[PDB]
Amino acid sequence: TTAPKPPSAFTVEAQRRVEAELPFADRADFERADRGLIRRPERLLIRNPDGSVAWQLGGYDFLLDGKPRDSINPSLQRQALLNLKYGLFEVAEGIYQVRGFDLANITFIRGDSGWIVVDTLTTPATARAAYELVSRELGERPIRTVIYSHAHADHFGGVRGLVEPQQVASGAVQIIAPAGFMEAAIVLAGNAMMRRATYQYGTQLPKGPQGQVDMAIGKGLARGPLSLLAPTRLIEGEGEDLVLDGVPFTFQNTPGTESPAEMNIWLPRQKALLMAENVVGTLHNLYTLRGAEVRDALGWSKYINQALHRFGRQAEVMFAVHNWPRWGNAEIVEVLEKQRDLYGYLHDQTLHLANQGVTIGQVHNRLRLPPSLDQEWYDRGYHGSVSHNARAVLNRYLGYYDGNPATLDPLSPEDSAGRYVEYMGGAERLLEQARASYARGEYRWVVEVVNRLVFAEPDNRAARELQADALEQLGYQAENAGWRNSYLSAAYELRHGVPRDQGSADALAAMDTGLLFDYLGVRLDAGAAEGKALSINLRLPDIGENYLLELKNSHLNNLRGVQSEDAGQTVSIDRADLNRLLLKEVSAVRLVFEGKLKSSGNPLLLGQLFGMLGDFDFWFDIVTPAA
């Protein structure tokens, strides 16, 4: 049947096992998340200018009860409660945070004349709504300075809810980031990334006991326009000691951790340590299951130890861009140490195992945390997991292949499935014996093999539903947010199928010219390029950039700071205008007649180049072979 089935007796047995292993008697965080609450709006409904709902908490009311339900891992349900403690907070003297308005927190520091604001949330609507609370409770003041902790959409995404661009250009507002920021915010596997993000965040899922419950570092993500205002000042080297509105500020770049650009903030007046997303109320991801580049556990662990050693020693509160503060120099030194040696263990021991021959596809089943790290709530794998970080690590050092030539050149799962089912007595006998495995709770095994049958015959109703039940039974058990979301999302589309009938200005403007052409490079229908050849000098004089375009062997090349004598067209167009072109906010025909788009040589060639460009459908099949 197509609906969410109650937890099975094993799934419950699993939840009972969690009670037995995790120190639930430690309830301190509940006090730490309550501390300093200034205002908690009775209800929260934040609306984008479109009329759409960015952000909403009432779909999580069923959590407010605090009662058990057994289709939720009880450790995860605990984090889901603590992430529902939203509103305005004092962290320390003149430093404040609004939590539970979005995935991340926005943080307000008092200066002599007005707010220094750290990060800005995902979208303008929630940023705005958050600063309005700061204006209602603490009294209205202007935003002189906005600091990006690190280069994620979670933190620069609502900057247009707070300030608007002429304040920046005029300089009523400054905007600060670590060196690396603009390069790091910016694409090339974005369609793939955003589709597998629907899984990881469970975006089709309803909010509920069988659906979405929590996203580890927050409830979830706000939806709406993404914005992006460039920094006017960058922190270089190892950091800077700056004064902003008369408040002293220490930046400590940790490049190449949870982001390529990132920095911790040390506030010596309040003895406050704002640790970016380096350290939060969860084991962070080394590899997001969304799809990404692997992250350096080792430099991660090493930068937390540098923070322990320069600031952790003399700190009084430690707070972050997600989750909540911990006060007390003793709790601060311990947590930092434990987090330091979390990313260290994951790293050191994963590779220690790999130096004993344990592959990328075994290491997750062998690595376990020592008690002193497993028994911490801030060390649970809510966002990242022990399992998939150790592979991520393994994958960082040795790549995807396990050393075994049996798997050096595999057949696609759809083309391999048919013979798997034929060897196993066919579907009806594959299933029959699968149910027997289902009926004793080997949900990790049933998902692997029934998967084969769904790929061999994706119209087989029976294959999908059983696979779904194994997947949903597996999700109810999940401690990690992304896992739970991911699993249940699969079950959703096996039961119903996928949707059938289905830009940022700031982002495309943020995107480097060279990289646009690199993004453009990904466009190319090779079928259309086959046999083709052209070269085109592009010049964009607003930013003083000249590029050589060269298509040949079904590949678009681009090279900054060179032109050719032999190029068959010269195009001359401001980058500003070229974005409007790709954003369709002007017509090219309108640009050329305006004398904004200039041409010499063959005028067709640029048009030909863009004619050969395919597109990418958002709803591609993940759980079945292509429809």
Add this chain to the structure above:
Amino acid sequence: TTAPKPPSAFTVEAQRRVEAELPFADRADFERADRGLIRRPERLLIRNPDGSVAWQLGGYDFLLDGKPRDSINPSLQRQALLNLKYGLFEVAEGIYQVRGFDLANITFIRGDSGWIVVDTLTTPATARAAYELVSRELGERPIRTVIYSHAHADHFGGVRGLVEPQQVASGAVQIIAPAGFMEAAIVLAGNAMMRRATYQYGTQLPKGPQGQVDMAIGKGLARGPLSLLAPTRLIEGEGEDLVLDGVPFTFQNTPGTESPAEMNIWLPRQKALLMAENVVGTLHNLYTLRGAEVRDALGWSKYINQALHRFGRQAEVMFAVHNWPRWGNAEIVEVLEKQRDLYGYLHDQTLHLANQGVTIGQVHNRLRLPPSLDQEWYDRGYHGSVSHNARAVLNRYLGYYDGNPATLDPLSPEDSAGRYVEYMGGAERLLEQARASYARGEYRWVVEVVNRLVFAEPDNRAARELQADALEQLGYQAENAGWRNSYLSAAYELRHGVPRDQGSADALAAMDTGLLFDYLGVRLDAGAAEGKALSINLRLPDIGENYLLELKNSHLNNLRGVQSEDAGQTVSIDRADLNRLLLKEVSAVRLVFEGKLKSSGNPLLLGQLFGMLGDFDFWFDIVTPAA
């Protein structure tokens, strides 16, 4: 049984099918490889100071008749002959390389008063044996200058074969390398790598039609001591223009291509362009099979184009650190162009398909090169392959997890395998069907499925012998040198089982202290460190260095530039001696009595720490679960 089997009907149909796919008619490389030949010595026999053979070519005699064999892919056979074209060569005026003294080429350039040497092969014996031949053939000259094209050992490792410390330190010999060479030269999965490397290079195989025929960038790899001297000057920035003993050199750095530190070299006076390992006679690795970090196809494509646009236009000969030179600006331009568009198409088209939802499991079965690139020998996947570079590329952007929560949390292959065999009736009905499939040629199917049973029942001789039979046919088929070797090394361990048979001073000397201790942390047995906690101030007075060592929650941390007044112990020891300690040249005890190892605080802690350092077996089980 235990011996190698003939090519099957389906193996040599496959060998045939290459027949028409590939232009055996262009044999123009053969004149390319023959040209400039000054001497191919009678036979090649290079020994180390050991008495053992570094290098020898007489085991490749079977190819010298040059008759095709169906146990070899005819394209690899073409390369394998081409790489037999060893000896001393002229490339241009006053430019010579010896080829076929090691995996790479060594390059001698005439100066006003001596040689400029570019690269050093793998080990001191071969580089000295090269240098002697050059000295016999066209006169003894000193090497005043040695240049490292890049940071792989097959190019620096033979430097002590040509020079040694006092001529460098007197300044009679300078050493040029690209900035960042030393960190690039030097660990953390050093053991895993190497053992998966025996399979890549097929160190266990015989040289024969039924073993190791070639290694794509050359014959194979010489065996010997690994040396390394430090540079005296570095090329920084985008590059630099020097005059060495009257000869004008231009250096174009290409960092983060085949090596993190690399440079192409341009010689204007002969119009000669030495293209490092950016451009050689083969599709190179993006992802080495032994296990390493994914490399950046895109930067690689672009640096070739950049070189195309600075030099290629005006080059007359283009030679490289592997394989053979090519003459004619028209050819030289063309080759470059194709190579540029090769890695770029690889990068773009993987990302294109990925953006349409083609996962890490399908992509290599989707992507194909277009003819222009396919039908050039130098674009053949001998070293790297289109099939594993795509997956690497997909892997660099999205990671190892293909998106399907059926694979999110797999059971190890040896805990699921059993049911995979019970699912297929039993080791009876798996072998029955599997030998049926073997008769129809389905070798990529069979190596997958039987590996289920070899993992389920790692003693079953019929599973082991069949798996081996299917893997060998695949190895004969394979166009790739690593692939072939891996397939035919797997076969060899399945049949005979894995040996039960049972370090470079310069290498450790060049290893940063932090990095040395990062690796020691990896050696830490997690069981012996549980619950303990110690902190050590390490001082290394020779190099001015100070480290804080901290073990806690089962993790070894190390921190440069820090000292704690609460450390339980302070150990004071020249890095040079800590080297010697780790190279077992000298004992801990003797260093105490020579006043070379001093202590204060708790004198025992350093010993306790080292006591908790475990060890690794080299010969770990790859083709079966851990014995």
